[PDB]
Design a protein around this nucleic acid. Structure first.
Lengths: 96, 110, 98, 81, 97, 81, 110, 96
DNA sequence: GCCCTGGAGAATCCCGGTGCCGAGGCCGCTCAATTGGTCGTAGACAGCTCTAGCACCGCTTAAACGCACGTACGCGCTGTCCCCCGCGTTTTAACCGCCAAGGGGATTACTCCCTAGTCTCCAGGCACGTGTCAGATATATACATCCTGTGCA
DNA sequence: TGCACAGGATGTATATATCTGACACGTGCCTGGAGACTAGGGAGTAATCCCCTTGGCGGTTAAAACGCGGGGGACAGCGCGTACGTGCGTTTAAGCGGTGCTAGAGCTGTCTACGACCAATTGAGCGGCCTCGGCACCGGGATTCTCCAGGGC
């Protein structure tokens, strides 16, 4: 039995079924999307790491992520991303 | 006794894995400590970006009269959307091709 | 009397065709031999994954296509339609590679 | 050992690449220049890839090594890892 | 007959002089006013460090000088000696901006 | 509120920059084009520097903020921190 | 009793601070553990690079009839050395200026 | 007093007295040299961190530093830096 | 003699029918996420000092600005020729499928050496203070550079 | 009469003298690095499996190569007119120096809420499997675009 590998494939499929229900994806395209998610993750997390170091903090928080998003995304993408993340955090805090 | 397990992704309303993002943040040598809302924020942002790209790619696939999204559709979406072109301007997409573009001085003189 | 397309019609046709396609334009076996030869100077008895050779090919083709785009822009700036080695060199100097 | 393998990148192949680039007319001196440029690019990337492979203590160059080298050079490639 | 230099001698002289010197070539008060006006659109009642404005000026001059070098190269490619807005635009396009 | 401060860059200063860049002859539209290019560059950098300042909960932009922004844009500056 | 303290930099033969480099590596979020020879190697490399740049800059100052190195001399050293120029190809040195380069078509005809 | 700020100035001055015994340095040039050392440190440390993550290890070692130096320096610089670092590590192991 | 137009003719598009292999769903299992609890510290917060950024004024003068002239330079045009393109035939080697052997990547168990963590001790590096010499500036001078009027070979 | 030369003017390099303020050194102190030690897990090492890389062979075509004829694009030469460089006189803020004020950066002391850590339990996510329909390919017919020969104005 081959060793376990992790990918964002099932979540990419879920989002695809939300936005285009009668549409599918090929293996190469799924590989590309997995690479895209990993790249964006690394960019945002590295920027948040650098911000925390610059401010002499030991913790990466929601506002570090917010400032990293504002620094890395181009404009309208940034404001919509900030809206989505704020909404998610508010809902999480309201739940538990 | 112990309550039924809920995922933090379900608590936050996301299709992306909050717990996996938290583990990746903790094991990636970013800071000494990770806050509770940081994985929620990051998973939400990744989901939003994925949805944007997938919507544009599905539109391009519909234009091509295909049901399945392929790298050509991904590249067309990215290069035709300006902000995604700025975000991914240094990325190469395998089997993506190029946009159709001919300079007007090369067209036959009419 | 035999049919002849004028000088540039077929070139525009090829431009449209290859800008619509996505497949690789270099031959796989010659590219592989070139890669193995270049790698000889860095380490001996190297083995290559097939996906590694394919990734190298994709990267090289993308680089060359972008370079030729910039070269065409330089040639058009010089009021020409023929691309030249000096156009390649100007593009590489403005990009910051030489 | 291998020799003369830069000539396996032929004039019609460079023409196809130039057509995808939008080039209508190509000078006869373009082909040698493109061969030299390609050799330079390949040498850089393969040097970095073999360095990664040697650090891992492997004899086989992998797609992940190629991807890491391209990322180091600021030429990120999607779809291979 | 009063002395006149020919059109280009003084220009080459200025080239040599300003390529020998290292001082900042823009006036500091106008540059500072420009910086404050631009920052005004991102936040109100912002204060600045003198070193902040000085770093901004140094970066801006370095950028403009490098761009002008690339522009001169393009103009020479076009068999001219005069730089033009088309030369600036082509240089920026090949740079990636 | 400040207005009309891009005209303080002035034609002689743009000309001095072009002399340090090594150019001999200058067109009249170059000055307006250079004003626009400088404005774009400044807007990008100052936006990032104000983002850093607002993260630090400060009302003062600092040389560190400018250096971090320029490093974020691949334009590292030596001599201010 | 305990011995007289020796510095790791003196043990290595270096003028650069091995223990300070070790502390920076430990508090910099680069990995979970840092080996003993990593700061030694890093400090040696940093010393070598500093020595190269300072040598070229001192030569450039000597050509100017000066005894103090200034940013202009540093820029002249860096931009005249090819490998150092590649290393610092996208760095701006404050108060450094440019190299004296004029294109040949702009010089007067004989 | 003010809080202490660390720099590399005394060590850069030591190396300057080694290479050019009669040459001094101004404060701006010292700032530039400090920035240069911090930049090179950050570059090498980041490359080593990435190498260790790629190879699934928890320790940055001399092997990682050597590989990062090879990746980040051009040619003869890399050769001579590798020689210097190997010399330092050998001397340290001989001593203690 | 120049512009328009209708046929050829070649290429592309569109449609309908077949086969196939890769996407998509299902199933079992195991590893990672969730739950509940503890604890120790990072960070939020209030208070306070004192640095430095802002604002105003007056004066000197460098630098910008506006103007007039003329001269190189950009640009458009015209003519030559040669080189690149389109096409047809021959030759090469890519490509596909298949087969076989072995290197080397990938995994696992085991044990040891290396590194984190702690405590104590102290010397090296930072801030502060002070003095002197390198460099900046003035000034007069000598030399290199440019430009034109002039003459002749 | 078009190409060296003389000579004048202008700018620049060179040498010397004054002066000042920033570099380099000395001092005191404190905090971070070194010495000595323990405990635990990461990684080195050996052994083993099986995948996948390399090497070879043969047949089929697609593609590369080679040659040829001719049109169109590169390039050189020329003429014109205008836009920019050069210099001069007028005007405007820039820079510099003082002063005064206060907002906000920076630091300290307190304490509490939050994130690491741990043990136990379970379901979500991954690997292996199997199946069917989306797409690739083919072939044939319709449409579109290109080019030239021929005739009206």
């Amino acid at each position: 039995r081959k060793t376990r590998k992790e990918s964002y494939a099932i979540y990419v499929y879920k989002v695809l079924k939300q936005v285009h229900p009668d549409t599918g994806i090929s293996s190469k395209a799924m590989s590309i999307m997995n690479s895209f998610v990993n790249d964006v993750f690394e960019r945002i997390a590295g920027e948040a790491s650098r911000l925390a170091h610059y401010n002499k903090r030991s913790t990466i928080t929601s506002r570090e992520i917010q400032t990293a998003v504002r620094l890395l995304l181009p404009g309208e993408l940034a404001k919509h991303a900030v809206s989505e993340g704020t909404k998610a955090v508010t809902k999480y805090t309201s739940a538990k | 006794t112990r309550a039924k397990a809920k995922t933090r992704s379900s608590r936050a309303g996301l299709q992306f894995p909050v717990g996996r993002v938290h583990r990746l943040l903790r094991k990636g040598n970013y800071a000494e400590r990770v806050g509770a809302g940081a994985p929620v924020y990051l998973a939400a942002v990744l989901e939003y970006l994925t949805a944007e790209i997938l919507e544009l790619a599905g539109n391009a696939a519909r234009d091509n009269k295909k049901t399945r999204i392929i790298p050509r559709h991904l590249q067309l979406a990215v290069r035709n959307d300006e902000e995604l072109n700025k975000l991914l301007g240094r990325v190469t997409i395998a089997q993506g091709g190029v946009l159709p573009n001919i300079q007007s001085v090369l067209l036959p003189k009419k | 009397k035999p049919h002849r397309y004028r000088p540039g019609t077929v070139a525009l046709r090829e431009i449209r065709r290859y800008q619509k396609s996505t497949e690789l334009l270099i031959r796989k076996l010659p590219f592989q031999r070139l890669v193995r030869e270049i790698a000889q100077d860095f380490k001996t008895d190297l083995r290559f994954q097939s996906s590694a050779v394919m990734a190298l090919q994709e990267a090289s083709e993308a680089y060359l296509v972008g370079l030729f785009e910039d070269t065409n822009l330089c040639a058009i700036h010089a009021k020409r339609v023929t691309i030249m080695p000096k156009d390649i060199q100007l593009a590489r100097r403005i990009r910051g590679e030489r | 050992v291998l020799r003369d393998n830069i000539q396996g990148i032929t004039k019609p192949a460079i023409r196809r690449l130039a057509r995808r680039g939008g080039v209508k007319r190509i000078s006869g001196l373009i082909y040698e220049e493109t061969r030299g440029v390609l050799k330079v690019f390949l040498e850089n990337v393969i040097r970095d890839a073999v360095t990664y492979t040697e650090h891992a203590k492997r004899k086989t160059v992998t797609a992940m090594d190629v991807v890491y080298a391209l990322k180091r050079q600021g030429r990120t490639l999607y779809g291979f890892g």
